[PDB]
Design a protein around this nucleic acid. Structure first.
Ligand SMILES: [Mg+2]
Ligand SMILES: [Mg+2]
Ligand SMILES: [Mg+2]
Ligand SMILES: [Mg+2]
Ligand SMILES: [Mg+2]
Ligand SMILES: [Mg+2]
Ligand SMILES: [Mg+2]
Ligand SMILES: [Mg+2]
Ligand SMILES: [Mg+2]
Ligand SMILES: [Mg+2]
Ligand SMILES: [Mg+2]
Ligand SMILES: [Mg+2]
Ligand SMILES: [Mg+2]
Ligand SMILES: [Mg+2]
Ligand SMILES: [Mg+2]
Ligand SMILES: [Mg+2]
Ligand SMILES: [Mg+2]
Ligand SMILES: [Mg+2]
Ligand SMILES: [Mg+2]
Ligand SMILES: [Mg+2]
Ligand SMILES: [Mg+2]
Ligand SMILES: [Mg+2]
Ligand SMILES: [Mg+2]
Ligand SMILES: [Mg+2]
Ligand SMILES: [Mg+2]
Ligand SMILES: [Mg+2]
Ligand SMILES: [Mg+2]
Lengths: 258, 71, 181, 181
RNA sequence: UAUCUGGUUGAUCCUGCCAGUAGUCAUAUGCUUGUCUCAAAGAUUAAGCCAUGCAUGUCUAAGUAUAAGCAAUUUAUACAGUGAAACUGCGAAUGGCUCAUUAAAUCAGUUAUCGUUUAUUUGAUAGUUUACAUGGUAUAACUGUGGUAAUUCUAGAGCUAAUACAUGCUUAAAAUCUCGACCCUUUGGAAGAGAUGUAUUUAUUAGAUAAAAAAUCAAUGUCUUCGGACUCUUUGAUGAUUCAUAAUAACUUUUCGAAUCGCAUGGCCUUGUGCUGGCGAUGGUUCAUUCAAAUUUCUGCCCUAUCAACUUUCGAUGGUAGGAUAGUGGCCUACCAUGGUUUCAACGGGUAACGGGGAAUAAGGGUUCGAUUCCGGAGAGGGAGCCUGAGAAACGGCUACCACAUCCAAGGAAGGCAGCAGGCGCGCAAAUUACCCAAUCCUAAUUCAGGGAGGUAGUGACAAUAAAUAACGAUACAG
RNA sequence: CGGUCUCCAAUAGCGUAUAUUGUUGCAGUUAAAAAGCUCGUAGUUGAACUUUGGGCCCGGUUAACGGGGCCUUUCCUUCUGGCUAACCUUGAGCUCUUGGCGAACCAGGACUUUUACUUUGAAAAAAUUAGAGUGUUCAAAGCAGGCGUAUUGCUCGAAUAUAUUAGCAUGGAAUAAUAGAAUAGGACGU
C-alpha cells in the first residue's frame, strides 16, 4: 500500500465485536483515538449491535449528531470513535452510564453503573517522564497525559482519574496481593490476585495470578491492570466477577436456571 | 521463468534487455537523458544496434542440417 | 467480496454399490418406508456413520475424560431427543448398536402411517406433500422431517386442510356446484 | 537517480540478486551540495514529511566556539587547509564536516583583551585581577593569534543544516593536525 | 487391488493363471433440464490488443458572493435567506483487479528502533511576539477584444476578495547574569544600562551516590554569646546510554508565539456606541497516544553435482572520514588493508514459483493442489525519470524512449479496461454495454452530496439442500 | 405382392473421452541390483565407570499409585536491605507484655561449563476443520433466539478443542555430548 488504509473487512475485524459474517462485506474501521484498533469498540457497534438502540448506521449517525452520547464526560460525534477498556459512556436522555469492561468470555460487556461511579475512571500508568520546563507527567493506557503526578506513582501503577477535571484522585501501586484484571491473552477478562512477579531483564515480565477459586495462571505484565486490593475493587465488576468457569458446569447452571 | 519465451518480445524490448544484462553478470563465470527538463545520428545507431542484438532468431533445425551438409 | 457461505454434502456413495445383498437391503428399505430413491437411504446411512464414528472416537478416550463426558452426554441427549435411542439405553456402547431402521421410523412419513392418519406409507407421503399434516400448530410438507418425542403427540390434520375442518377442496366444491346447477 | 536501496548490491555470499521491485521514493538520495567559500547562497529543500533542510551552496561566516574559555563568536572563514577524507576538497576549498579550516582571529582577540586585560575603570581592573589566574593559554594558540589566522574544525554539516559552525583546535588535536600539515 | 463374471478340455471337481469389473477429483464434451433455498463465474504460461459508456469528488450556523442568479423584503444604506461559477481546505496514495517478475527474495512465526518519519484522532502545551487591526509587493470567477481544423488549449486588456499570498504590535511580577557612571580605598559599595519564551546549529556543564572519620593551601559566604561555630542542605527513568530535563556562550536569506469565523447579548459602573464577559468552529509550537511507514534479529522454501569453486578491474569483506538519507548501513565518495561463502552443497541453471491461512486423499506415516471471498508483497503494454503532497517513484498524475494505435484542413493534437459492462485475438461461438445507493462501510467543508467499493435482479444443471410427476376404491379380462 | 417387443441400473439427473520409493516399510546366490582389490577426507556411528542404598515426616488420590519435605560425610557462596519466626527472659492472664538474640523467607548487588532431550505455560488473526446450544416448515445453513403480554416488558447466548518447526518462560536430571587441577599459571583463608 502507498499509504494508510481506510477500509476493514468483516472477516478481518476483531472477533470480540461479534459481527455477522454475511450482513455485509465491510466492518466499521475505528478511527484514530485513545485506544488501539484491535482493543477498541467503535460506538456504532455499541449502539447498534449491543444496545440495539439503532437499527442501522444512519440512525447511529442521527443519534450522535443529536449530541446525546458522551464518552468520558465529553460529547463525541464520530461513528467510529474508538471507545475502549474502562471507558465511560453516558446517555442522558435514557439516563444510563456504562463502563466498558470485558466479560469472562473475553468480550466487552454492557455493564450499567451509577452516576457516582461514572464520575471517575481508572488508568494504567504506561509512562512517567519529565516534560518541557521540568514538569513531570504521566501517560496512561488511554493516551491521557496528566501533569504534576504524585512522585510515588510509577509505571504499572493505577491512577483514579476524575473525568470532570482530569486529575488523579488516588492511586494503587503494583505489588503482590493486589487485585488485577486481565486485558489480553486467552485469560482475557479474568480477575485475580497477584502472587509473584517474575522479572526478566531485556524481556517480557511474567505475573502469576490466583483467582478466588484457587486456580493459578501466568500472564505477561502488559495484559495486567491493577483494579484494587483483594475484595475491595474500586469499580463495580460485571456479573461473574471475572471468574473463569468450565464447560460442564456451564451446561449445569444453564440447566439449573432454565 | 526469467528467460522464458514471451508472446510478443517486440512489445517489451526493454524488459528483454534487462534479462541480457542479468545473464551477462550471472554467467560471467562461464564466459571467462533527463526527461524532466524544461527543454529537450549516434542515437539512431544506438537504436538500430540495440534492437538488432536484442532480437536475433535462433537458427533452426533445418538450418543446422543445411550447414552441416554444406560443409 | 462477501464472506463465503459454507455448504456440505449430506450423503456419500457406498464402498461397493453392487453387492447383491446390499441391493436387496435398499429394496427392503425403500419398499417398507416408501422412499423415492436410493439417495435417501445413502443420506441416512451417512448420518448414522458420522454418529457412530463419533461415538467410537469418544469410546477410545479414557473414562472420566472431560471431553468424553461432555461430548458423549451431548450425543446421547440428542439421540434420545430424536427418539432413536431409548431412555433405558443411555450409554455410548448402545449408540454403536443403532441401525438405519431406527432413524427411518422417526421420519414423518412413517409416523403418519403408524398413527393411522394414512392407509399406506405412500398415502402418508402424498398427504404430507399436499399440506394436510401439521405438527403442533405448523404445517409440515417434508416427508424427511424427523419427529421428536414431544412433537409425536401433536401430529394432526392441519386446520387449513379440508380433512382438518376447512372448506372442501376444489374438486369437491366443483362437483357440488355442477350438481346444484 | 541516486538511491540508497541495498537490493542492487551483491549478497554476502556474492550472489547477484534479482530485481525485486522498482525504486521507492523512501530510499531516494539527492545530489551533493559542495559548499564553497563566498557570498552566502542557501536554498531550502523539501524533505520527507513537512520538514525542511538547508543547502549551503556558499557561505563565508560561521559561529566558532573556543572551548577552553567556553566562548563562541562569529568569524569569517579564510580557507580550507586540510581534509581527512580526500585532498581534492582541500584543493577546491569545499566546506564539509571535519574539514580543517583557517578563521580570522580578531573577535576572539578582542574578547580576550577585554576579559583578561592582557595582550596576545576600577570595576574593569577588579574583574581582570580576579580572572588573572586563568590568563595563560597554550603557546600554539597564541602564535596563531599573532599571525591572525586560527586553525579550526567544522563540527556542523553544511550540506544539511546550512551552517558552518566549528571549534578551535587545541592540545593534542592541534598537535596532530599540525603534524599532518 | 478387493468382490463378481467369463476363458483356460472329451466332461465334472480342486487349485493356479489370464481378461473384464474400483474410486472421487480435474479437463473437454453429449443428452435432459418442472419447484424451494443457496451460491460461483480465470486460464492460448495471450501481464496479448480494445470501439463506446461509467468507475472521485466534496459545504456546515461557523474561510471568500454587489452572479448585471433565484426569492423574499423595508427584520437593516456595509453583508446577512438560498445560491451557479471561481478561489481556498481536504480527498484522489483508500477501494477494485491480476499474479508478469521474484528461490533466504516474498511470506509465516518471533524480535528491535537507545536507528527514524508520521497528515489525522485523543490529552496536554505558549503573559517573554496602525492594533478600534497593515499591503498588492494580486489574481481567479466576472466585463470585453481574439487565435486554432481540432482538445478538460488558451493570448491581450479591464475589475475585486481570503483561514490564499506577504507583513506586523499590543499583557504580571520577580529573580538571575552581564556591562557598569560615580563615591571610596573598604570585608567595599553602587545609580544606572542591557539580556531571559519557543524553533535551528555548534561548543561546554549538571544529570550523585558500598558504606565512616581528619589536617592544611587558595577563594569565600552565613552566624553568634567576638569566641569560634556553621544542622535538617537538591537530583527522575531504563537491563543499559552522551536518556528525559536543565544550564552557559553565541548562531540563523530561520520558524512559532491567532490581523480568522458562527450563535447569543450577560455583568459593572464615573452613562460613555465606556470597561468587562458566555457557548462553539477553524488554525498553531512541542511532547505523548493512535492510525501508519521504513529498516531490522533467529528459524523455516520445489528440481538440478553430467552446476565445484564463487565474489573482488566496474564494492566483493571490513576500518577510518565525509556526502546523502527521516534515519542505521559500501547506500555513494576518498584512503586503507584482503578479505567474504562453500560437499552441513556456495555459485550457476530450471520452474507452467506470488507466500501463507487453507483444499483433497490417507488407517498412520506421507503425496499432491492452493490465480481464486482473508492477511502480506509486486504491477498497471516494456524500461527510465519526476512535481505535488504527511503519505506515490502514483500511472482512471506528468515527461522521454521502445512497440502499437485514434483524429487531421498534414501545420499539429490525443492514448493506456491486470476497474464495472461489452468486443477482437477463428472461419467454430457462452453472463447484462441492466437497476440502485435502500443495507455494509468509505470520502468531503460533511447527518443531506458522491461511491460499477458494494447491493438488487437477469443470464449455460459450477459446487450444494429439500423435493412434485399421483393417492384411495370398484368393475372387466388372462393364467 | 399390393397399399401412405421384454428386462436391468441411476434418476432431475445420466453418459462418453483423457488423466488420475520402503523412516515406520522394499530387494540385491540360483531371474532387476554388492563396485576387481586396498587405502583414505567429508558425512554417519562409536566399550564401561562418577549419589547408589537405607531410616523417618507431611499431605493427596483410587492396600496399590504417584506428590513433596528432612536425616544418613550430601545444604551453592558473599555482602547489603526489609520484615520477623522460633529461643531466652520480665510483668499481666496456651494468650498478651518488657528487654535481648535475630533462623527462615523476601528484594537487590557480587559469584557463575555449556547444550541436546522431555514436562508444563504464554504465542500461533479471523475465516476453514472438529465441535456445544438453537423446530431456518426439515435440511444445507445462519448465529440466532427464548418467555410472558389487558398494561408495561423480562431474558439466555453467540461456547470449547486443534495446530508442525523456530523464538520465550518453566519442572525434570534417566540418555548423548561439552569444560575443568599435570611443568600446578590449581582450590580455600579471620
Ligand atoms: Mg524493552
Ligand atoms: Mg392450502
Ligand atoms: Mg446441451
Ligand atoms: Mg414434468
Ligand atoms: Mg409454487
Ligand atoms: Mg485546490
Ligand atoms: Mg509466473
Ligand atoms: Mg535461480
Ligand atoms: Mg531471512
Ligand atoms: Mg480530515
Ligand atoms: Mg491537538
Ligand atoms: Mg490581467
Ligand atoms: Mg558513517
Ligand atoms: Mg571506492
Ligand atoms: Mg505453487
Ligand atoms: Mg494463493
Ligand atoms: Mg503501484
Ligand atoms: Mg493489457
Ligand atoms: Mg509509474
Ligand atoms: Mg484504466
Ligand atoms: Mg490507480
Ligand atoms: Mg473487464
Ligand atoms: Mg461483479
Ligand atoms: Mg469551516
Ligand atoms: Mg572421517
Ligand atoms: Mg558409551
Ligand atoms: Mg515450540
Amino acid at each position: 500500500a502507498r499509504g494508510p488504509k481506510k477500509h476493514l473487512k468483516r472477516l478481518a475485524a476483531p472477533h470480540h465485536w461479534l459481527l455477522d459474517k454475511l450482513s455485509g462485506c465491510y466492518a466499521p474501521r475505528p478511527s484514530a483515538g485513545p485506544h488501539k484498533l484491535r482493543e477498541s469498540l467503535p460506538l456504532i457497534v455499541f449502539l447498534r449491535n449491543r444496545l440495539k438502540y439503532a437499527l442501522n448506521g444512519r440512525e447511529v449517525k442521527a443519534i450522535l449528531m443529536q449530541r446525546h452520547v458522551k464518552v468520558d464526560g465529553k460529547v463525541r460525534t464520530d461513528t467510529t470513535y474508538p471507545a475502549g477498556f474502562m471507558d465511560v459512556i453516558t446517555l442522558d436522555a435514557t439516563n444510563e452510564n456504562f463502563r466498558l469492561v470485558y466479560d469472562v468470555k473475553g468480550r466487552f460487556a454492557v455493564h450499567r453503573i451509577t452516576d457516582e461511579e461514572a464520575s471517575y475512571k481508572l488508568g494504567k500508568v504506561k509512562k512517567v517522564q519529565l516534560g518541557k520546563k521540568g514538569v513531570p507527567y504521566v501517560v496512561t493506557h488511554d493516551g491521557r497525559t496528566i501533569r504534576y503526578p504524585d512522585p510515588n506513582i510509577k509505571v504499572n501503577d493505577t491512577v483514579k482519574i476524575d473525568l470532570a477535571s482530569g486529575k488523579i484522585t488516588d492511586f494503587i501501586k503494583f505489588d503482590a496481593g493486589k487485585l488485577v484484571y486481565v486485558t489480553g491473552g486467552r485469560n482475557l477478562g479474568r480477575i485475580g490476585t497477584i502472587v509473584h512477579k517474575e522479572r526478566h531483564d531485556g524481556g517480557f515480565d511474567l505475573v502469576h495470578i490466583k483467582d478466588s477459586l484457587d486456580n493459578t495462571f501466568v500472564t505477561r505484565l502488559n495484559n495486567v491492570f491493577v483494579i484494587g486490593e483483594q475484595g475491595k475493587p474500586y469499580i463495580s465488576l460485571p456479573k461473574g466477577k471475572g471468574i473463569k468457569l468450565s464447560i460442564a458446569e456451564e451446561r449445569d447452571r444453564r440447566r439449573a436456571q432454565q | 521463468g526469467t528467460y522464458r519465451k514471451r508472446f510478443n518480445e517486440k512489445a517489451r524490448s526493454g524488459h528483454m534487455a534487462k534479462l541480457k544484462e542479468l545473464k551477462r553478470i550471472r554467467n560471467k563465470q562461464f564466459t571467462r537523458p533527463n526527461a524532466n527538463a524544461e527543454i529537450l545520428e549516434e542515437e539512431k545507431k544506438m537504436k538500430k544496434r540495440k534492437l538488432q542484438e536484442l532480437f536475433t532468431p535462433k537458427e533452426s533445425k533445418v538450418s543446422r542440417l543445411k550447414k552441416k551438409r554444406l560443409d | 467480496p462477501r464472506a463465503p457461505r459454507t455448504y456440505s454434502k449430506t450423503y456419500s456413495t457406498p464402498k461397493r454399490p453392487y453387492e447383491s445383498s446390499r441391493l436387496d437391503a435398499e429394496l427392503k428399505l425403500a419398499g417398507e418406508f416408501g422412499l423415492k430413491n436410493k439417495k435417501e437411504i445413502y443420506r441416512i446411512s451417512f448420518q448414522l456413520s458420522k454418529i457412530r464414528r463419533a461415538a467410537r472416537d469418544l469410546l477410545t478416550r479414557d473414562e472420566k475424560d472431560p471431553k468424553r463426558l461432555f461430548e458423549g452426554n451431548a450425543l446421547i441427549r440428542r439421540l434420545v431427543r430424536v427418539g432413536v435411542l431409548s431412555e433405558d439405553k443411555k450409554k455410548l456402547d448402545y449408540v454403536l448398536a443403532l441401525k438405519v431402521e431406527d432413524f427411518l421410523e422417526r421420519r414423518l412419513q412413517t409416523q403418519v402411517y403408524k398413527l393411522g392418519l394414512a392407509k399406506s406409507v405412500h398415502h402418508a407421503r402424498v398427504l404430507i406433500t399436499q399440506r394436510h399434516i401439521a405438527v403442533g400448530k405448523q404445517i409440515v410438507n417434508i416427508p424427511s422431517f424427523m419427529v421428536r418425542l414431544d412433537s409425536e403427540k401433536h401430529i394432526d390434520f392441519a386446520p387449513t386442510s379440508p380433512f382438518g375442518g376447512a372448506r372442501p377442496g376444489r374438486v369437491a366444491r366443483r362437483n357440488a356446484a355442477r350438481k346444484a346447477e | 537517480g541516486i538511491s540508497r536501496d541495498s537490493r542492487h548490491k551483491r549478497s554476502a555470499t556474492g550472489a547477484k540478486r534479482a530485481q525485486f521491485r522498482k525504486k521507492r521514493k523512501f530510499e531516494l538520495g539527492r545530489q551533493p551540495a559542495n559548499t564553497k567559500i563566498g557570498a552566502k547562497r542557501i536554498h531550502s529543500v523539501r524533505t520527507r514529511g513537512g520538514n525542511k533542510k538547508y543547502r549551503a551552496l556558499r557561505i563565508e561566516t560561521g559561529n566558532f566556539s573556543w572551548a577552553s574559555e567556553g566562548i563562541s563568536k562569529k568569524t569569517r572563514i579564510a580557507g580550507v587547509v586540510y581534509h581527512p577524507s580526500n585532498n581534492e576538497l582541500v584543493r577546491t576549498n569545499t566546506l564539509t564536516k571535519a574539514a580543517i579550516v583557517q578563521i580570522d582571529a580578531t573577535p576572539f582577540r578582542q574578547w580576550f583583551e577585554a576579559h583578561y586585560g592582557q595582550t596576545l575603570s576600577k570595576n574593569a581592573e577588579r574583574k581582570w585581577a580576579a580572572r588573572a589566574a586563568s590568563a595563560k593559554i597554550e603557546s600554539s594558540v597564541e602564535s596563531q593569534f599573532s599571525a591572525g589566522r586560527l586553525y579550526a574544525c567544522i563540527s556542523s554539516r553544511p550540506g544539511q543544516s546550512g551552517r558552518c559552525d566549528g571549534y578551535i583546535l587545541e592540545g593534542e588535536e592541534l598537535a596532530f593536525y599540525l603534524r599532518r600539515l
